[PDB]
Amino acid sequence: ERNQRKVYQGRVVSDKMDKTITVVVETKKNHPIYGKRMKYSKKYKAHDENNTAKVGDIVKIMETRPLSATKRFRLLEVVEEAV
């Protein structure tokens, strides 16, 4: 331990699976030629060993190590729970 990882925040899309949720980060970028601020998104995959969070909820994650075939993030805390 001397440094951190790529902690990202994002809201959950779907959590049908066991101990596993599906966070979506989102951000905005600039077009190459024009200067219009488009926006695109990513779909990450985390690991919550007790199925805490539920759908439509905002959380923050941290990259861990290859933990499955395409599942490599960790949950930290439900920042703003929703209902």
Partner RNA sequence: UGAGAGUUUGAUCCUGGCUCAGGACGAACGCUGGCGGCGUGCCUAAUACAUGCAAGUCGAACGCUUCUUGGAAAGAGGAGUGGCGGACGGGUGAGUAACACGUGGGUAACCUACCCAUCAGAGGGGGAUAACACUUGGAAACAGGUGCUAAUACCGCAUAACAGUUUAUGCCGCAUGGCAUAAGAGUGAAAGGCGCUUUCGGGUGUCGCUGAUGGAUGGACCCGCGGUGCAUUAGCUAGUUGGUGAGGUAACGGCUCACCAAGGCCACGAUGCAUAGCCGACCUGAGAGGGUGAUCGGCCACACUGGGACUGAGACACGGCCCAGACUCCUACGGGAGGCAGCAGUAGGGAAUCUUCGGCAAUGGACGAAAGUCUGACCGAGCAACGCCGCGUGAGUG
Partner RNA sequence: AACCAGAAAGCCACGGCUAACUACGUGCCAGCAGCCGCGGUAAUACGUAGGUGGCAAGCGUUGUCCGGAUUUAUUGGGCGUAAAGCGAGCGCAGGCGGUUUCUUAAGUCUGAUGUGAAAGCCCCCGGCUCAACCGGGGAGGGUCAUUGGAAACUGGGAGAC
Interacting residue with RNA among 50, 69, 77, 83 (CB under 7 A): 69
Span between the terminal Cα atoms of the chain, in Å: 37
Beta bridge partners of 40: 27
Site string for RNA, 16-55 (x = CB under 7 A): xxxxx-x---xxxx--xxx-xx-xxxxx-x-x--------
Sheet containing 37-43: give its strands across.
Answer: 37-43, 23-30, 8-12, 58-63, 73-80
Q: Where does this chain bind RNA (CB under 7 A)? A: 1-6, 14, 16-20, 22, 26-29, 32-34, 36-37, 39-43, 45, 47, 62-72, 74
